[PDB]
Amino acid sequence: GKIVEIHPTTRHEGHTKLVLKVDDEGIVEKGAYLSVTPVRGFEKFLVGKPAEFAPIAVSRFCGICPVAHATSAVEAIEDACDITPPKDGLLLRELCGIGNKMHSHPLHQFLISPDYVPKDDSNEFIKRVQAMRRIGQYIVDAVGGEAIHSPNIKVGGMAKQITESTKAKMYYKCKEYEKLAKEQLEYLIPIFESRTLNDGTELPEKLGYHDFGYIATHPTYGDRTKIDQDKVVEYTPFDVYDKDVAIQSSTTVPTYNGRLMEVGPRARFSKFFDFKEKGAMALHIARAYEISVLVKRAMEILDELNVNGKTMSDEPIVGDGEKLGLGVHEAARGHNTHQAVIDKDGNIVYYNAIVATTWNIPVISKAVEGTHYKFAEHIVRAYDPCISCATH
Amino acid sequence: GKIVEIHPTTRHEGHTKLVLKVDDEGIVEKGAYLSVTPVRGFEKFLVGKPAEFAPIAVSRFCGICPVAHATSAVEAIEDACDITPPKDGLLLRELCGIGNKMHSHPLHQFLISPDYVPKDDSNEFIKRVQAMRRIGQYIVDAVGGEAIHSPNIKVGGMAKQITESTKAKMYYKCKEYEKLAKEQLEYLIPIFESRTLNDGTELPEKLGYHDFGYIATHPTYGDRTKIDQDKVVEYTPFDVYDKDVAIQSSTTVPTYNGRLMEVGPRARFSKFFDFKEKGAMALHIARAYEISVLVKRAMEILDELNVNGKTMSDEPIVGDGEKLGLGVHEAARGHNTHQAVIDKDGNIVYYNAIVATTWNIPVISKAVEGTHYKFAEHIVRAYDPCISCATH
Amino acid sequence: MDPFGKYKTVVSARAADKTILKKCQDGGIVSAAYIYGLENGLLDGVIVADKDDKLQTTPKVATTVDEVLEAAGTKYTVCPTISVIKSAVREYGCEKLGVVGTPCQIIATRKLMKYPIGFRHVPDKLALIVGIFCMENFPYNGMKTIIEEHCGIKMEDVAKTDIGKGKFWVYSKWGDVKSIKLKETHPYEQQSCHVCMDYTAELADISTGSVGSPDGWSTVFIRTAQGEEFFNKMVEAGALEVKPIEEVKPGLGLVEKLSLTKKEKNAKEIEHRKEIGLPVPY
Amino acid sequence: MDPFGKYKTVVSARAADKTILKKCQDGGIVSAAYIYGLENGLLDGVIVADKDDKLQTTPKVATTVDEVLEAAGTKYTVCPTISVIKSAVREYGCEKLGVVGTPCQIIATRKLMKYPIGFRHVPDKLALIVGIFCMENFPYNGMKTIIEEHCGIKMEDVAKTDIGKGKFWVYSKWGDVKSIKLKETHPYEQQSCHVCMDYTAELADISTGSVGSPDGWSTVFIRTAQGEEFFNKMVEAGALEVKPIEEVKPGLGLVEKLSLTKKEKNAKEIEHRKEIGLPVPY
Amino acid sequence: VKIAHIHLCGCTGCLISLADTYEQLLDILNSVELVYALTLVDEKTEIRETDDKILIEREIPDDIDIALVEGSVCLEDEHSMKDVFDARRKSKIVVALGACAATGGITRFCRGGQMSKPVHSSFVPIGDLIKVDLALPGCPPSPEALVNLITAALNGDTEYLEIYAELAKKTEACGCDLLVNVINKSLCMGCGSCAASCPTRAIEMIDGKPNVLKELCIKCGACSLQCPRIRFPKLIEEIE
Amino acid sequence: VKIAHIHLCGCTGCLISLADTYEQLLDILNSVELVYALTLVDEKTEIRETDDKILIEREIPDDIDIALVEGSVCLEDEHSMKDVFDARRKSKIVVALGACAATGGITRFCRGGQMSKPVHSSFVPIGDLIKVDLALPGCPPSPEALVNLITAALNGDTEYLEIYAELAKKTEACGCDLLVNVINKSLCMGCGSCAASCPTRAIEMIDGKPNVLKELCIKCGACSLQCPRIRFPKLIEEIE
Numbered sequence A, B: 001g002k003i004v005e006i007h008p009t010t011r012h013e014g015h016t017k018l019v020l021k022v023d024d025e026g027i028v029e030k031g032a033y034l035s036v037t038p039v040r041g042f043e044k045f046l047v048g049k050p051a052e053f054a055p056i057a058v059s060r061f062c063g064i065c066p067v068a069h070a071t072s073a074v075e076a077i078e079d080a081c082d083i084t085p086p087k088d089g090l091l092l093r094e095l096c097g098i099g100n101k102m103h104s105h106p107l108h109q110f111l112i113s114p115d116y117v118p119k120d121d122s123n124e125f126i127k128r129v130q131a132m133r134r135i136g137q138y139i140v141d142a143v144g145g146e147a148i149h150s151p152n153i154k155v156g157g158m159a160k161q162i163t164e165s166t167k168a169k170m171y172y173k174c175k176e177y178e179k180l181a182k183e184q185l186e187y188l189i190p191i192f193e194s195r196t197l198n199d200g201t202e203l204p205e206k207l208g209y210h211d212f213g214y215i216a217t218h219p220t221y222g223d224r225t226k227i228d229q230d231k232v233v234e235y236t237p238f239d240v241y242d243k244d245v246a247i248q249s250s251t252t253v254p255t256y257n258g259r260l261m262e263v264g265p266r267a268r269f270s271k272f273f274d275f276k277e278k279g280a281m282a283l284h285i286a287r288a289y290e291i292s293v294l295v296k297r298a299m300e301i302l303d304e305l306n307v308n309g310k311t312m313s314d315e316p317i318v319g320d321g322e323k324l325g326l327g328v329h330e331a332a333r334g335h336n337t338h339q340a341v342i343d344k345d346g347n348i349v350y351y352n353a354i355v356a357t358t359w360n361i362p363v364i365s366k367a368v369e370g371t372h373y374k375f376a377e378h379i380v381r382a383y384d385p386c387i388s389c390a391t392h
Numbered sequence C, D: 001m002d003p004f005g006k007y008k009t010v011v012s013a014r015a016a017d018k019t020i021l022k023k024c025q026d027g028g029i030v031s032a033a034y035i036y037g038l039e040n041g042l043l044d045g046v047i048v049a050d051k052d053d054k055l056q057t058t059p060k061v062a063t064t065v066d067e068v069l070e071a072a073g074t075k076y077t078v079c080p081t082i083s084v085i086k087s088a089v090r091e092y093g094c095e096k097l098g099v100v101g102t103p104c105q106i107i108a109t110r111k112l113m114k115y116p117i118g119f120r121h122v123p124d125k126l127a128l129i130v131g132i133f134c135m136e137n138f139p140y141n142g143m144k145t146i147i148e149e150h151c152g153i154k155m156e157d158v159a160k161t162d163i164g165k166g167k168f169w170v171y172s173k174w175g176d177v178k179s180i181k182l183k184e185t186h187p188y189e190q191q192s193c194h195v196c197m198d199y200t201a202e203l204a205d206i207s208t209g210s211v212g213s214p215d216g217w218s219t220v221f222i223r224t225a226q227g228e229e230f231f232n233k234m235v236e237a238g239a240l241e242v243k244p245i246e247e248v249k250p251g252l253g254l255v256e257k258l259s260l261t262k263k264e265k266n267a268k269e270i271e272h273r274k275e276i277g278l279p280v281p282y
Numbered sequence E, F: 001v002k003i004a005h006i007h008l009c010g011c012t013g014c015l016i017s018l019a020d021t022y023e024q025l026l027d028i029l030n031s032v033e034l035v036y037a038l039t040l041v042d043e044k045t046e047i048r049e050t051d052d053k054i055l056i057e058r059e060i061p062d063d064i065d066i067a068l069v070e071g072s073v074c075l076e077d078e079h080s081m082k083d084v085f086d087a088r089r090k091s092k093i094v095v096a097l098g099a100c101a102a103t104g105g106i107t108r109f110c111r112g113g114q115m116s117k118p119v120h121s122s123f124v125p126i127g128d129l130i131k132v133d134l135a136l137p138g139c140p141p142s143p144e145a146l147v148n149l150i151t152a153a154l155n156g157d158t159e160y161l162e163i164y165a166e167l168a169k170k171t172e173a174c175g176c177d178l179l180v181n182v183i184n185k186s187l188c189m190g191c192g193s194c195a196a197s198c199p200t201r202a203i204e205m206i207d208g209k210p211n212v213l214k215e216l217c218i219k220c221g222a223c224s225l226q227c228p229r230i231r232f233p234k235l236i237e238e239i240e
Ligand SMILES: Cc1cc2nc3c(=O)[nH]c(=O)nc-3n(C[C@H](O)[C@H](O)[C@H](O)COP(=O)(O)OP(=O)(O)OC[C@H]3O[C@@H](n4cnc5c(N)ncnc54)[C@H](O)[C@@H]3O)c2cc1C
Pocket: C023, C024, C025, C026, C027, C028, C029, C030, C031, C032, C047, C048, C049, C050, C057, C068, C071, C072, C073, C074, C075, C076, C077, C078, C079, C081, C100, C101, C102, C132, C133, C134, C135, C136, C137, C138, C163, C208, C209, C210, C211, C218
C-alpha cells in the first residue's frame, strides 16, 4: 500500500510521469502514465494560417518523427481539397516516411540499449545503430530536403525530384542498411526473447499485457479508408486518471468505439504479418522485425520510382470550408492522424492531431499494472513513447 | 537662349522638375517635365507575394488616389484568374472609386486656388472644398473601410456589406455634396473661362495646347475592353528627353500606337460628353464638371445597390501563371492600368502599373512649349499631376 | 491604494423591464442601458458578447433590442469586444456607439480614444462606454473543463453560470444547480489577468457588477458626465429601479474588499514579473 | 593595405580546349576547371550562372560539360549562385560540388562553411571554390539601360560584354562593337558593392580574372591546398596553358592598382556609412 | 509656430490625413505658420540667374519649429539623403509622420530593380539617419491622432507626447510585436483593440487571441501603439 | 567537462541534430561527461521515501559545465519556469540550443487554448528569463554547427564563439532581419546564401534580392546568422 511516482521517466522523448499505486509487495495495482509537457498548441495556432504552413509547423511536433506529421498534415489537406498527388510524388513521400522510420527504430534500440545490450557490446552496438540512422537520415535529407523537418513534404505531393544518381545512391545505401539490419536483428531478437535485462534480472512473462485492440491502416505508409474516423472520439484525462492525476495530464485520450487502442509496430505486425504475441517484449520484437520490412519497401519504391515523373500536383489548395479532411500515417510509433478544414482561400479553418503516442499513453497506464513497479519504465520504453509528439 | 529649371514644382502631389529651353523672350521652346521621386518599386517587390497583398500594397502608391490602384490591382488579378465579382460588390467598388474622386477633384481645386481664387474668397472656398472632401472621404471610409487605403477593395469584389442605414446616409450626403458642387461649379467655371489669374495675369489663349489623343475607357469606373493593351508600349526617358534630363526621370513613358496620350477628366469628357476644347483651362473645366457626373453616378449606384447582396465572389484566386490580367480604372487623374500574372497558388508572377500621371508627364512636357515659362507651372497643375502615383 | 477610481455616485440598481430581468445576469443594467439608448435614439449600435449553443463567444455589433436580449448574461470566457469597434463605425455606420467590456477592454477603449492612431473617425462616435466588473477571465477550453469536468454539465445544457459566495455556479437547462469552490477554477484562468489592476472598470462611463448588491441587483458606479446624463435619463424614464448602496446588503464594503484584494494580489505578480525581467505595462 | 589576400602563386593561364576559348569570357579558367573536374570525377556538380536570350541570369546546378559551356562568359548582373548550394547537395546529390562566384559570394561560401547553422551536410561536399575577380555589379535593369540606352544594342543582340581599357564593351551578334567610358556605367551599379573590400576573390581556392593578363588569357591566383592540387592536376593533364605572370603584360601591377583602388575607395564609403550611423559588416 | 511638411519617400496620405481634419484644417493652419510644404505653398522660392540658366528653386527654409517629415529615405537617392538631413538641420522638432518615416512601413519591402531608377532599393525610416523627436505610427495615422499631436506640441503637453517621444527611438515595427511583446509574455488579455487598429485588417481575433496574417502586414505600428498591455500611461485614466 | 541537455518546450530535433553526428557522437560523448539528458541517461536519480509514497526523481545535477538548453519556456507552466532557472543555477555555461531556446522559433506562434492545458499560451526564448552565454539559431542547427560549437567550447576558441556569444543577447529573429538589416541598408549584394540557409525554403531570390515568404518563416534566425553582410569576423578569412 504505497504510491510510487517516477518523474521524469527517461530514455524516451519528452517529459512524462509515472504515478503508480502499488501493493505491499511492490506490484502495480493502478497505473498512470501521463505527459506533463507544456502544450505548445499547434492545432489551435494553426487556425487562421495558410494550408502550406501546416506541414511546416506540425513537423515541429517532434524532431524524431517530423516526417510523420508533415505527411499526415498534407494528406489531411489533400483529402480536404480532393487534391490527388501524382504517382511519383506519392512514391517519394512514402519513401521519406520510411527513411524517418529507418532512423527512428535504431534510435529507439539505442535508447533502450542500457537495459538490454551488455556493456562490452555497447560501443559496437551504438556504431551499428548510428550507421543505420545515417542511411535513414540521408533518405529524408535527399527526398525531403532536410532530415529534421522536411520542407519538401507539401500539399500536392513532394516539392523536388531526385536524380537517377541520387536514386541509385539511396538504393545502394538501402542494401547496406539491410545488411546492418540483419546484423542488428540477429543480435537483438535473442535478447528480447530471453526476457532478461543486461544485469541479469528476469522479466515477468506477463510483462506489459493488456486487453486492448490495435489500430494500423498500412504496413509502411497509411490508408485513411482503413479506419472509420467517426468511431474515434477523444476524451479527457478525467476519463482515465484520478482527479489529482488527470489535472496534470497534457494529452487527450483517443478511443475507438469508446475503447483504448494500441498503435505502432506490433499493431502493424498484428494486422499485416500475423504477429499475435502480447506483452512488452513482443513490442521490441515487432519493432526490430519492422526495420527489415521498411528497407525492403524503400528499395521496392526506388525500383518503382520515375525520377522524371511529376511530384507536385497542379491542383490549387481550395477547400469548401466544411469537409473534415483525414490524413493518417503509420509513424514509427504508430497510427498518426491529422485533420483539417480548409476554406476557398486555402486557409486553415479547423485543425486536429491525434498522434501515435497519444493513443499509447492510456494503454501504457494499464499495461504497467500487474507487475512490480521496478518494471514499469521498461514497459513504458517498449512503447517507444514520444511525448512532444503526443502533446503537440 | 536660356535654360529655365523650376525645382521642385509645387501645389501638386510629389516631386518633379521643369527643365525648359526658352528663347530670348522667355517662350518655352523645348519642355521637360519629369518625376525625380525615388522609385519605391512596387511592381518589382510584388513579384513573389500573394495576390491579396497587391491591392493593399499598391494602395500606398499614393494617399490621394489609393482607391484607384486597389481597384485596378483587383480588376487585373480578377481578369488573370477569370474571377467575376458579384453585382453588388462591383457597385460598391465603383462607388468607392467615385467617392475617392469626389474628394480628389475638390482637393486639386484647393491646391490651385492660390492662383485662381481671390484672396477674399479663399476661406469660404476652402470650407466648401473640405465639406465636399468630407463627404467623399466618408463614402470611401464607409465602403472601403478606410478613406486613405481601403482594405475592403479585394480580389473577388468588396469585403464588407454596408447597411441600409449606411446606404441612406451616403445618399443624403451625396445630395448635400451635389448642392455644394453646383455652388463650386458656378463659382469656378467663370474664373476658368476668364483665362485670368487672381492677380490679373491674362493667360495665353493657346495655353497648354498639344496634338496628342486621349485614352478613357469609362466615364466613372473602367472598361478593359475599350483599350487594346497590346498597342500600349512603355518607353524609356531617353526616348523623350535629352540625355542629361532623361537620366533624372524616374518614370516610364507610356505610348499608345507609338504615340503619347493624355488621360484624365478632359479625356473622359471628350470621349463621353462631346467636350472638344483644347488647352489647360479646358482641363480645369472638365475636372470641375466631372464632379457633378460623379455624385450623380454615386446616387445612381446607391439606388441600384442591394445592401444584402453578395459582395465577394466565392471563386478562389487561381491563375495559370501565364495570362496577363488587365485591370483598368479611370482614376481622378485618368486611365490607370495594373497588370498581373498569377500562378496556381495565387502568387504574383509578374506585375506592372501604368499610372494616369505616367501618361500625362510626357504630355505636359510638350504642353508647356509655345508659351512663356512663367505659365509652365500653371499648365502642369492643370493636369493635376500625382507623382508618387506616376513613379510607384 | 485607491479601491474604485473616480466616480460621481455608487448605487444598487435593477432594470424595470421584466423581460430583461428574465434574461440578464444581475440587475440587467447593461441590457437596460443598451435597450434604452436604442429605443430613444441615444445609441444606434451597441457592442455585445454573444454566445452559441456551446457558450463560445463572438463579439457583435447589435442594432436591435432582440440582439441585446440574446446577448444578456455573462459568458466567463474571453470575448474581444473591442475588435469590432471599427466595423461598428464603418460598414455599420454607427455614430452613437455603445461599448461594453471588462475593465481591461474599457482600458483599451480609453487608450484608443486618447491615441487614435489606427482609429480614424472612431472616438467621436462612442456614445456610452459600459464597464462590467471582473476578477479574472478564462480561455474557452478552460471554462469548458471547469463546467464539463468539474461541474459535470455539458456546455449545451448550461442555462447560466455565475460567481459568488466563494463559488462558481452552473445552472443547468434541466433544473440542476452545481457549485464548486473558486479555488478549483483558478488553474484554468487566463494568466494575463494576473497583472490586471482594475476590478470595477474604473474608466467606464458607467460600471456595473454583481458584488455588493443582492441577487437580481447590480452595483452601479456612475463615473463620467456622459454616464451621469445617460443614467439619469434612464431613471427619469422609469427604466431602472434604484436604491442607495448604503441601504443594500452586503454593500460597498464587499466591493472594496474584493477590489483591493485583486489590486494587492496582482501588484505582487507585477513586481514578480519585474523581478524576473518580464515586461509589464507602463 | 594588402592587395591580394593570401595565395601560393599567381599565373597567367588559358584553357587548352579550343571550344572553351570560343565560348569563354577570358582564359576560360572557370569552364576548364569545371569541365576537367566533371570529366575526371573530381566534381559531380558545378554551380553556374546561366543566361536567357535577354541576359537575365539564373543560378543553376550544372552536371554536364554542355551546361558548363552554356554558362561560359560573364553576365554583368547579379546572379545569386550560393542560393542553389543546398539544392546541389540535396536533390541533386552532389558530393564533389564546384562553386563559382564574385568575391562576395565566395565570402558567403566561406562563412557558411565556418558557421554552417543552416547548412547541414553542405560544407564537406564542397570540392572546389572558384572565385572570379569583381569590381562592381548591377541590377539587371541597370545593365539593361547601359546596353540598350547607352550602347544602343538590344539585349537579344548581345553576344558578349566586357570591361577593360577604361571602358564597357558590348559585342553584338551582328558584328558591331560598342564601347562607352566606365564613368557612364557607375550610376547603374549595385550600391551595396560600395562596401566591398575584396577584388581578387581572396578566399577562393582558385581565383581567376581578366585584369593583368592579355586578351584571351586570365590572371589566376592559386590560394588553397585544394586549389593547388586541382590546378596542378589540370596542368599535368594538359587542360591549361600557363605562363608566369611576370612574363605577361600588363602584369600583376595592374591587378595591384585596381585591387587597392577598390579597397581605398570602398573603405571611405564604409567610414562614411559608420559616420552617419548606417550599418556595415563587422 | 513655424511648421513644415517634408515629403520624402511617402504617398502623401499622411498629409491627406491631416487634410482630413476638413474645415478644422483652417483652424490648424491659422494656429501655426505653414512655412514649407511643396504640396501646399510655393516656398521657399529662390531665383539664381546666370547667363545661360535661370534656376527657380523651392528650398526648405531655415528656422522651422516643427517638421512633419513623411516618408522614408532612399539611400541611393542623393536628394532624398540631402532632404532628410536638411529637415533635421533646419527644424527644432522633427516628427516622423507615418510608418514610412517612423519605421519604414510599406517601403520595408522595396528591393529595387524597377525603371526608371533600378538602383533605388534601400529605404530606411528617417530615424536611421537623423534624430527624431516624435514618431506617429500608422499608415496613415488618423486625423485625430495628428490633431492631438499638434495640439500637444503647441501647448507643451509633454506628458501626452511621451509615448510618441518614446516611439521616436523605435525604427522597426511588425505585427509580430504583439506576439513578441504581449502574447508570448502572458500579457494579452484578448481585448481585440489591436485588431480594430489595423489598417490592412491583417489581425484576426481567434479564440480570444490575435492572429497576424503576416503577408498582409505593412509594418505600420498601429497595433503595437494601441495595445494597452504595452503602453498605458496614467493620463489615459483621466475621464470626465 | 560535464555537459547536460535540458529539454524545455522543444521538439528534441536539436538533440537529434547532435545525434546526427552519427558515429562521431561517441567521440563527442567520450570527450565530455554527459551528466544529464532525460532522453539518454537516468540522471540524476534521487529516491525519496515517505510513509505513503516512494518518489523517484531524475533531477538536474549541480556543477554542470555546459548546459545545452533546447526549447522555449512556457510562462504558464511552473515546471518549465523552474527548469530554466535550475539550468542557469547549476550550469557554468548556458547554450541556447536551437531557435526555440534562442529566439522562440515556432513557439512564437503559440497562443494557447488547446487541451489538455488550454492556459499554456506564452512561450519565450530562455534569454527572456536567464542569462544566455551562447545561442545557436536554426531549426535545428546543423550537426556541423553543433560540433564546431562544442569543439570551440572545449578548446577555448573564444574567437570562433564570439558570433554566438553575440547572438545570445538577441531573443528575436525573423526573415525581416534580412530586410531591416541588409536590403533596407544598401548592404545586400544578392549572394543568395540566406536562401540556401533557410530550413523552410521561405526565402526566394527574385531579381538578385531575397523575397521572404513571411507565412513560411518560423523565426529560426538561420538566414540572419548566415548573411555575411551582417557578421563577417576576420576568422572567416582564414583558408588552407
Ligand atoms: C469574465 C467575467 C468576470 C466577471 N467577474 C465579475 C466579478 O468578479 N464581480 C462582479 O460583480 N461582476 C463580474 N462580472 C460581471 C457580471 O458577470 C455581469 O456581467 C455584470 O454584473 C453585468 O450584468 P447585467 O445583468 O447588468 O447585464 P446583462 O443585461 O446581463 O448583460 C451583460 C452584458 O455583458 C456582455 N458580456 C457577456 N459576456 C462577456 C464577456 N466575456 N466579455 C465582455 N462582455 C461580455 C454582454 O454583451 C451583455 O450585453 C464579470 C463578467 C465577466 C464576463
